[PDB]
Symmetry: C5
Subunit: 376 residues, 5 copies
């Protein structure tokens, strides 16, 4: 993930132009190889035309170039690119929104599962670890970076996400499917056992715990669904062929012809086709947006930091359920204990951000005395 929120916080002079001096996750980094290939082919064709071709062959090549330049518009690359990229971006944000965060579940577990002793600590840690194990299983099934980190269940055991007993259990229940769903059944059964054993005081608390776990399960199922059901290959091929055919046509239709013939478009000859290169950047970068966002769990610069998410979730959930359980800061009267209208101060750099309350768009409407009189 490449973040430039701090850079684009305000709409300053050349705000988006300053972002053109970036390399990581940039259009240059994404399409420099394709641009080099296109440049090589373009200049190879140019040299072939100027040198190898005879006079009649050159005349035929010039007619071909004029014809290709005239027929290029008949490729609606922009229409298809816009629609396809919109679809890809929507799927990308949905896939992010389906990333499971254990914060709500961990707060519920810390609040509800009682016991400051070893048994209570173990129960809370086991529940949060089941949640994290399910999340990590789905993530390693759907993300190449997570898979490289944990290429096997033995790797998961060594990393601490799974105990040897849990690994042995997963083996006994093994079925010819992805077993990311097992930790949720484990969580349900362990929560029921805790409620029956008095560690969870009420069925409403148990139900809340299971509701949070089920929300996480739905998120993981959505991640699996996005991984499995790819965007239609036919649609992807349609967009790809459009872009590639456009630029393959440009390779012959944007060659500078010998000025001796003085064709309307080719009176002046400069070696570099600057506007063809600009079109290449525009269209191929538009395509690269989809090429990078189609699988947001790869190893691209703008792909999600799944490994960091996993590490942070483990740390935060374990800390919340173990060290933060029934461990609260001292409860004392606050700064505004007897202040009817608290007014937190402003710093010098923030004093200009003090605004009056907005009371509604009708607040400033002016009416006469007779206008406001109720009628019988």
């Amino acid at each position: 993930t490449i973040t430039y929120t701090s850079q684009v916080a305000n709409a300053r002079l050349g705000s988006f132009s300053r972002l053109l001096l970036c390399w990581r996750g940039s259009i240059y980094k994404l399409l420099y190889g394709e641009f080099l290939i296109f440049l090589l082919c373009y200049y190879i064709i140019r040299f072939i035309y100027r040198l190898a071709l005879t006079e009649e062959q050159q005349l035929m090549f010039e007619k071909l170039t004029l014809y290709c330049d005239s027929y290029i518009q008949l490729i609606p690359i922009s229409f298809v690119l816009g629609f396809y990229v919109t679809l890809v971006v929507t799927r990308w944000w949905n896939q992010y929104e389906n990333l499971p965060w254990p914060d709500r579940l961990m707060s519920l577990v810390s609040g509800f599962v009682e016991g400051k002793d070893e048994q209570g600590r173990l129960l809370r840690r086991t529940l949060i670890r089941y949640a994290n194990l399910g999340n990590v299983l789905i993530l390693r099934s759907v993300s190449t970076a997570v898979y490289k980190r944990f290429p096997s269940a033995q790797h998961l055991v060594q990393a601490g996400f799974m105990t040897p007993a849990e690994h042995k259990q997963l083996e006994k229940l093994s079925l010819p499917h992805n077993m990311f769903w097992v930790p949720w059944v484990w969580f349900a059964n362990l929560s029921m056992k805790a409620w029956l054993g008095g560690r969870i005081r009420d069925p409403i608390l148990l139900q809340s715990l299971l509701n949070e776990m089920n929300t996480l399960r739905t998120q993981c199922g959505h991640l699996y669904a996005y991984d499995w059901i790819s965007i239609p290959l036919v649609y992807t091929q349609v967009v790809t062929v459009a872009v590639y055919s456009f630029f393959l046509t440009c390779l012959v239709g944007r060659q500078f012809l010998n000025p001796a013939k003085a064709y309307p478009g080719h009176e002046l000859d400069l070696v570099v086709p600057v506007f063809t290169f600009l079109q290449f950047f525009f269209y191929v970068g538009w395509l690269k947006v989809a090429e990078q966002l189609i699988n947001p769990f790869g190893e691209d610069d703008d792909d999600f930091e799944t490994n960091w998410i996993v590490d942070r979730n483990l740390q935060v959930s374990l800390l919340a359920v173990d060290e933060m359980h029934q461990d609260l800061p001292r409860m004392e009267p606050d700064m505004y204990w007897n202040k009817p209208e608290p007014q937190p101060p402003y710093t010098a750099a923030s004093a200009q951000f003090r605004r009056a309350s907005f009371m509604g768009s009708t607040f400033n409407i002016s009416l006469n005395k007779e206008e406001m009189e109720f009628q019988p």
Copy 2:
């Protein structure tokens, strides 16, 4: 379903160009016959024009071709196709999202329904089987593959999805409607009976079970609604007529005219309309996307794997509710039992994915000593 997520994980050089080589569920497989027909018609017209027509006929044909060429417009067809395809793709993804997964309900059943004895086993299995039976009924109503697998309720009984007693009850209840709703009423009544018999210990747990079952029922109802209420036939015919009128006009407007006549745009006389064929590929593939995705439960290569979904749901739900009930791995302290900040290790292949935590976009904002001072 055709999956290429592995292939498109990273935005490598020519990633979509590599996908262009796939055959299954591809644009070539979808439109080769239509392309053959279009090519045959185009070249029949060409041969007629250049072999049979007299001089006057040829002059009239050239005038008509020049007249036709101006009519062809890309904007209207592009708009109609883009909107129709966007609607079709949105409906296709919604239809997938309405596929019922019994994971949440099965975890709830495994947790809440008590009893390791034969009666408890039977109760849990019957509940999960009612859920799966409703799912399979709707799926065989809406999916041709599932229907071919289970062409009759007797086939459902033979496959083990429905018992002879359940089949008899369904026949007794038969109404002139799709009876896919009966298993949900059965599930509600059986859950109420289990709660009254002490197998379910709390009405809160009963309510959670019924909420999950009702979510499944709503998903099945959405599947039925998508199967029943097709996209407006008028809209489908409008898009089809747009595409066919465009290409029928092309069949003449794109004919190469005798270059001797020195017509404005017909200098070069190639035998193949390369750009017209590229337009055919793009637009007919865009239409084929909607043709394939309009009914995602058919037998297309890109259609859903309803049979696999049914089998996996049955196996997973039965295992969870029967073998996984109150069967948990030993609860023991984990690797980070007394590690305040656990740090799971990284492998050699994943060490490059270790990232520092993102602490916010305002983190790096610099302020002076005076700027950070509160004012009264």
Copy 3:
């Protein structure tokens, strides 16, 4: 509602072409009268120009055609139609999604409301009938077909949806508003009475029932809102004028002038404007899609089957709450009682749909021995 899902299940050769031979709910059926009027006007203008203009007249009619045919492009017909029809289709699907289905509420009632005696039967039937009565009241307020079926509350009483006592109570409560909301208050009060009388065993069950009933009420309110708040009249008029002015201009801009004049494009008199007719079909059908879907509760072929929905809902809900209450099939061990991995059989027609489970896109990633080794 015209269903062609079975026909468009697979993307076959001419899949959408075969849909052009349909009559009910078709473009021809929708716009044949408009096309006939346009054709009559066009051929009246042709005859007027060819046999009523002296010559200077003919010369000015030519000049008017060579002007209308050129400024015709000024109309943003495609943009307007696309953007308006997208909104119309979205509203149409939302209106369908707000159709109340009593399946969840009826399962909840059948389960929760206890008593196999006459009083229990009456209570369950009365609750489900209140739900159905509210649904039918809103449907007859918003749908012309349902109103024609039940043009009065006396008709509702004669049809069995409302009791004479309920009709008298409605007349007693009558306010100068649509009284479709009364059955929901009746349902809430009857459920409270049933809980107080011991027929409902728990406030949690009562809350679940009221949640389902309130979801139904929200759906009915959304139906009322869609009926009341029509799409902006200015927005509809803009698109209507855009289409009508375009096709009124075409009447004089797409005429075949005298070939003697040798006007460019006007040299050949084909009599029949094939492309003008194709454009008429395309655009007027794009507009007819919105015309038909703007009120999905009218009497068009593609409008919702509100009467069938009412009948099916009544029958299904009554059966579920009366005949199916505490009436379950015998609970016996299933076919896979002791089968760890059940595998339902495949028929000959479906054997090709047996697929290997998808284990994730990272499943086939290959790594070296050192790549998978954890580092310190």
Copy 4:
């Protein structure tokens, strides 16, 4: 709000054409003044050009007209208008969807708040009046019509929405913010008091009441947010500048030049620029749609009927919570008491709407005996 649903129920001949004869909430009513100003400017410029200008001044004006006519483009304005109007319409429908309806809360209050005596009547009426008071406060904050009806809290007291005691309490609680949130705190505290006093029999019922009240609070907050956070003024100015620059250019670029000059675009002047006026109609009406819908709580014809909504909500909620409390129609067996399959009759006007049930798209598939046999 202008309603034409009954008029557009069926897609009849000229269904949308018949709507061009309406005045209220019409494009004519919205843009007639702008059209008159534009016409005056156009015919001032035309008369200056053919009268005041000298012989070479006319040539310069013709050159300017051609130069301007070249730069009049449809796609940029069309695209910006489409996107902006789509956003405006989405916000308009969301703002309607956030209008609070007290129906669910009133049904819950009537059911749960027990007691047919004076204390119970007062409690139920006070709760429903708190809900209505919050709704009215937000409505008078966000709607000009509601503000004009109730320009002060004293007006609210006189109208009966607030008691003098509630007005005094609001004055005591006065903060420098909009105080529409106070009635929700009042409702929560009164509900807790009622539960503690035995009037509400269960904390589950209390929770349901508070959930409905909080849903209403969220709707009111969304209304406040839409009132406060307007669409970006930059975006509005961009769209306005696009439209106005277009039609300011059209003032000179669409003048009828001298036909004798034989200019390509001007061989026949019609005095009245019919197509220019049609473009003005289309684009200015498209912009006026957004102008009217940007604030749907104004006083336009198509703006929401907030005053009627307030009146109806008050009347319906008070009736439901006071007169309909534990007042049910006599519970008696219905018409289909012992009818296994009820079939309500059809009138002569609706007999054609009787339909056979839809059993699924796979119902009609035909399979051979060998094809339907399960394989080992």
Copy 5:
């Protein structure tokens, strides 16, 4: 945040025209510097071409001028700008919708947390302060104005949002991540303590409180996600490159060539490219919309008022949980105590807004005696 809802309440004459006289948050304020730079470059190029080039160089520049003009298109730029700006606007509205408001939680806390003594006051205030502290932590993480107001946790303690004990606890819990999640765990633990101590009378009320707190936590997590996962830098660079390349080509393509050369479209030599400047305004403002809305928490005119939101939330929540707890206005019969149909009066200004109730679109349908007769 710039509000003009009161200005655009009604669609009046020049409604959006009067919005062009605004400076704050205006297109002029956003793009004046860029327009100045573009103008300076354009006139530098013009002066060079007109006073420094020789005859042959001027001829070459003239040819390059038409070459550049031929290499300019509007369709792709409009398409990409429209889709990118739509995405940015959707994200902007989502980011606003994820701003946490403590209204529902504060009402629940005031209702449920019992006790008018100091312990109860302290408990309620501490819970509401935990919610506000979490909100403020996320806000200072994601918003530059809030960060400048509270550049440190010491600043938060000095402003009263955090106590010294809470600050010490946060330091003790410090992890290498954003610690904005700690207050939710604190809230859950304090709520559990309050329920166990009898301050919360029921686990149902506890569950409601925790559900509201978890909704706030989800909103804060969405704010963090929007701050962290920026829109793809490739997409941003693509849009920026499109716009900037378009105008870079325009710099030379829109130069006014020497009129003496009588080029196709350069007869006039207006010194100011009025239409090029209008296009600059249009497109650069369309881009500046996205530039301003990409980070809605900066310090732009149209950016959210996070500081005011924080202050208002603190004041309102503290008042609601402390002073408004069990402090209700006297419950007395209302104005319509025994009026079956209350009719609040209308003022002279709003008398015209009194409307008859909408009874549905089928209300005015007319039927015959035979038509409305039920059939056998």
